[PDB]
């Protein structure tokens, strides 16, 4: 399967700079595709907690970009210009093997508030 996350400025319900959806449960071998539904945003790994031995993603700016669900675990992905405004998304590839890293990972402010929300969405 191939899943679509939209890069978007506002959500219908007020608050700004959002990936929609913010969480996505997928399978080994699937591809998530983040998409310039609005210009201004990009998608890219969150290195501080991104897992061992895996193709980092630093997709381009205002540009589409794809993730390859190879190894199975959780995959945090910011939009660099707006990560301080909480524009962030979480991708689950089967087992959440590396949840404990992710929980410890010290996100702050709108990043933390939103990401923790995505964290609860984790299927165990």
């Amino acid at each position: 399967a191939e899943h679509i996350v939209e890069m978007r400025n506002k959500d219908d319900a007020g608050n700004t700079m959002v990936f929609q959806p913010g969480f996505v449960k997928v399978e080994a071998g699937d591809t998530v595709k983040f998409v310039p539904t609005d210009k201004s945003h990009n998608a890219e790994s969150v290195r501080e907690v991104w897992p061992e031995g895996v193709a980092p993603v630093k997709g381009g700016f205002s540009k589409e970009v794809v993730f390859n669900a190879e190894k199975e675990g959780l995959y945090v992905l910011k939009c660099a210009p707006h990560y301080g405004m909480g524009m962030v998304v979480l991708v689950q590839v089967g087992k959440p093997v590396n949840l404990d890293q992710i929980k410890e990972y010290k996100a702050t402010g709108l990043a933390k508030k939103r990401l923790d929300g995505e964290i609860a969405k984790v299927v165990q």
Partner: protein, 334 residues
């Protein structure tokens, strides 16, 4: 009707300079055209090299002053480059309707809009970005400036008598809320967004890290001091879009001052210190009588000297012993 009237276009100038313009004018109503471009950028706000993740109209804090006359129409074209990361817009305290323009100027990065409104009321008026949910951030980060709307035949004293300035300097005071690390050093952010969460927290304390004229401690001192000459009359236009201040010219006065900043009302005279309400702009006239360096400041002296809210006016000419003379200079006591 407005579509019918002559469309002039003005070129703006960086503060403190104000663009050139007629005070009194036999000229009739016209639509005046401006353009301003929003620039987000890191700016240096003091001598220690502390930075601010700033946002500005047209490269500067404040944004340039816009000058027109009563009954003109203002036509602002507002551009927000894709080099930017945020939405912006504009609230003209001089407009009527649409949250002062804000609704009809919501531009994303790569967008631009054009908005016309009517200057039915004279005075100095604030303009600032007001994007919804982030009004106080964008404004304290530097997105404010002044719109002067002169009466159609000049500035006027309480006895209806005419009044004239030889130049207008514009000053924007900026209360800043720059965060710190646990080591008491001011923080340095690598992008604008990373500034947000820390900055809002400093905001909520209501205690500025700095308070500055035109962008930096020392913006208007030394070789960037303001200048004038004995006999010359200056208009000092003070704006503060978020917080109160109390200007004062040391060794001087406000010969005539509209501290609420609205020319329709009679000015007060002989002021030592006047008061700009946060979210207002005001103006004051002084005809210089003595040479020397003057200090133009917020007369909270902590805010002035400790936090950065002071500038200088270098003034040339002929000392005058009637007003003031030294009888005996510092000499020892008998």
């Amino acid at each position: 009707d407005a579509d019918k009237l002559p469309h002039t276009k003005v070129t703006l100038v960086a503060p403190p300079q104000v663009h050139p313009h007629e005070q009194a004018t036999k000229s009739g109503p016209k639509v005046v055209e401006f353009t301003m471009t929003i620039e987000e950028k890191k700016m240096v706000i003091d001598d220690k090299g502390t930075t601010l993740q700033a946002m500005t109209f047209n490269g500067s804090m404040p944004g340039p002053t816009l000058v027109v006359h009563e009954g003109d129409y203002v036509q602002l074209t507002l551009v927000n480059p894709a080099t930017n990361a945020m939405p912006h817009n504009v609230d003209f305290h001089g407009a009527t309707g649409a949250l002062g323009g804000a609704k009809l100027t919501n531009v994303n990065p790569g967008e631009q809009a054009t908005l016309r409104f009517k200057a039915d009321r004279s005075g100095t008026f604030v303009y600032h970005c007001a994007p919804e949910g982030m009004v106080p951030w964008h404004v304290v980060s530097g997105m404010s400036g002044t719109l002067m709307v002169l009466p159609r035949d000049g500035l006027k004293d309480p006895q209806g008598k005419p009044l004239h300035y030889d130049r207008a300097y514009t000053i924007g005071e900026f209360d800043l809320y720059i965060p710190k690390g646990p080591d008491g050093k001011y923080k340095d952010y690598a992008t604008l967004a990373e500034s947000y969460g820390d900055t809002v927290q400093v905001m909520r304390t209501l205690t500025p890290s700095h308070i500055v004229f035109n962008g930096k401690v020392g913006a208007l001192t030394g070789a960037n001091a303001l200048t004038a000459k004995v006999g010359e009359t200056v208009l000092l236009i003070h704006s503060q879009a978020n917080r109160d201040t109390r200007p004062h010219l040391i060794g001087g006065h406000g010969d005539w001052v509209w501290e609420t900043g609205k020319f329709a009302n009679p000015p007060q005279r002989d002021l030592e210190t006047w008061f700009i309400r946060g979210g207002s702009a005001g103006a004051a006239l002084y005809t210089f009588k003595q040479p020397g360096v003057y200090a133009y400041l917020n007369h909270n002296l902590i805010e002035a000297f400790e936090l950065g809210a002071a500038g200088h006016i270098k003034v040339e000419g002929k000392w005058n012993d009637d007003l003031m003379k030294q009888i005996k200079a510092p000499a020892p006591i008998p």
